[PDB]
Structure 1
């Protein structure tokens, strides 16, 4: 097996120009705030499985690894809101993640607001990264509860510290709900999936560098005329479903001692990771699926909106 080789296939990061744009703007957002005047506050959108959590994890490592190794400083944070969050819930989650208070027994919303304003300049917080902002949309109704948003404005004005709120595209309406919170978050970037297959696009060079990064020694056959077309046909732009297929195909080619990833175990990987794919979608690998013009259209505008459009 060699679980070292398996972990190498699973942990494969390839930097796209969109990710380098987000990382450059994140470094800019941090280094601009003097923690006296109002910070910059970016909002990053992005659909279900574009690689937002990978972007935050890549930034976390490249920013706070040596500083966290130095001592209890924790310069940048990573916060994942709970579903249907109250201000007290997201406040105490921000508290128990940041350093080591108890913080989650005494829930009174005011004294723990005083605690984390006492503690944010104490440890030396430089940035707050919130991952889930679509949790502030109520599930079955379409009201967006503005208590956490107003509390985020409150904690932003009280202690001037830049906040980079991530979320799905339909979380925009939560920023539309509060006009003051809308005005604060000026910088808005859309981390949207891969666009076209025509070739010599960002998708080809991405698969070229991922072909390089794969733990096979000789070639993996990606980013050619035939296989790129089949690959985009399987996974439209969704980075997770593409990486899942590539991961299952790699560990399949590792299991039965092979040269590389071939059109032997790729078909098996396609039939394995095609459960989540929609009703009308066709698997382009099986017996005789001539990959069509209609399969390779760019992803829509409302790609991450559909759950909001379902009600």
Structure 2
């Protein structure tokens, strides 16, 4: 099999214009603020499993590498607020990820804020990439905790730094509660999945570049009107499901060695990674079942609101 081929098969990153826009907006949002006046700020929406973490890692790799290699600078962070997050727990994390491992033994929203606001300029933070806000909305109850959003408002008033605050599109409610919290985070973005299935667009070139990035030296197997339609039929929007199917196909192709990912391992790959899909969803690969046009309607505008619309 060889570790490098499977490694490169898993790490086959190509950039959709949405990702390029987000990377440009991040680079902008970083370059704009001079760590003196009130920062510009930003919020990304996206959905459940599109590539938010991957975009953050891609940004971290190009940005933080050379600065971190020099010494203890770490210009950019990676935060992930816990389940039913409180300002203590957020600030505890903000400290934990930022160099110093101390201030987690016995601190209760007193001196941790002061030392965090004192050390942020000293260490040299130029941006904060917060990843998680799905937790601030409660699971059963329709209530949303504001304490964290207010604490973010206060630390943003105290120390000046751009904040990116990634979170599912139902997390908008978190901002809608507190007036100027909605007001402050003005610049806003959708990282929504692929809409059109027909081809000769973003999906076709994405699969073409992906097939160029795949480990097999016998050219692209995908980018054909017959095959592309079934891949969209399998994975509607979620790039996770698509990349999983491609990965499962690739490892099935290198196993009992083949030249390309031909129409024989896709049926197994599809049957394998069809656990997360609903009962209503149908597998296009399972048998001789012709893909239907009505099934390939674009993903709803309420794509990441399902968890919120449960209650």
**Given the two structures, how large is their TM-score scaled by the length of structure 1?**
0.99
Q: Is the 8 A contact 1:220 1:262 kept in 2?
A: no
Deviation at 1:64, TM superposition (A): 0.6
Q: Is the 8 A contact 1:43 1:185 kept in 2?
A: yes
Q: Is the 8 A contact 1:95 1:101 kept in 2?
A: yes
Q: Is the 8 A contact 1:64 1:76 kept in 2?
A: yes
Distance 2:161 2:110 in 1: 19
Alignment deviations for residues 235-274 of structure 1 (CA, whole Å, 9 cap, x no partner)? 0011000000000110110111110101111111000000
Q: Is the 8 A contact 2:47 2:192 kept in 1?
A: yes
Deviation at 1:220, TM superposition (A): 3.7
Deviation at 1:219, TM superposition (A): 2.2
Deviation at 1:101, TM superposition (A): 3.7
Question: What residue number does 1:287 align with?
Answer: 287
Q: How many matched pairs?
A: 311
Q: Is the 8 A contact 1:76 1:128 kept in 2?
A: yes
Question: What residue number does 2:148 align with?
Answer: 148
Q: Is the 8 A contact 2:208 2:222 kept in 1?
A: yes
Provide the alpha-carbon RMSD of the alignment. 0.7
Alignment deviations for residues 201-231 of structure 1 (CA, whole Å, 9 cap, x no partner)? 1100000100100001112411111110010
Question: What residue number does 1:38 align with?
Answer: 38
Deviation at 1:110, TM superposition (A): 2.0
Deviation at 1:199, TM superposition (A): 1.4
Distance 1:277 1:81 in 2: 27
Distance 1:226 1:295 in 2: 15
Q: Is the 8 A contact 2:39 2:162 kept in 1?
A: yes
Q: Which runs of 5 or more residues in structure 2 are unaligned? A: none
Distance 1:185 1:227 in 2: 42
Deviation at 1:4, TM superposition (A): 0.7
Alignment deviations for residues 49-101 of structure 1 (CA, whole Å, 9 cap, x no partner)? 11000000000011010100010000000101111001000100010110124
**After TM superposition, what 4+ stretches of structure 1 lie above 2 angstroms from structure 2?**
none
Question: What residue number does 1:119 align with?
Answer: 119
Q: Which runs of 5 or more residues in structure 1 are unaligned? A: none
Deviation at 1:177, TM superposition (A): 0.9
Q: Is the 8 A contact 2:198 2:225 kept in 1?
A: no
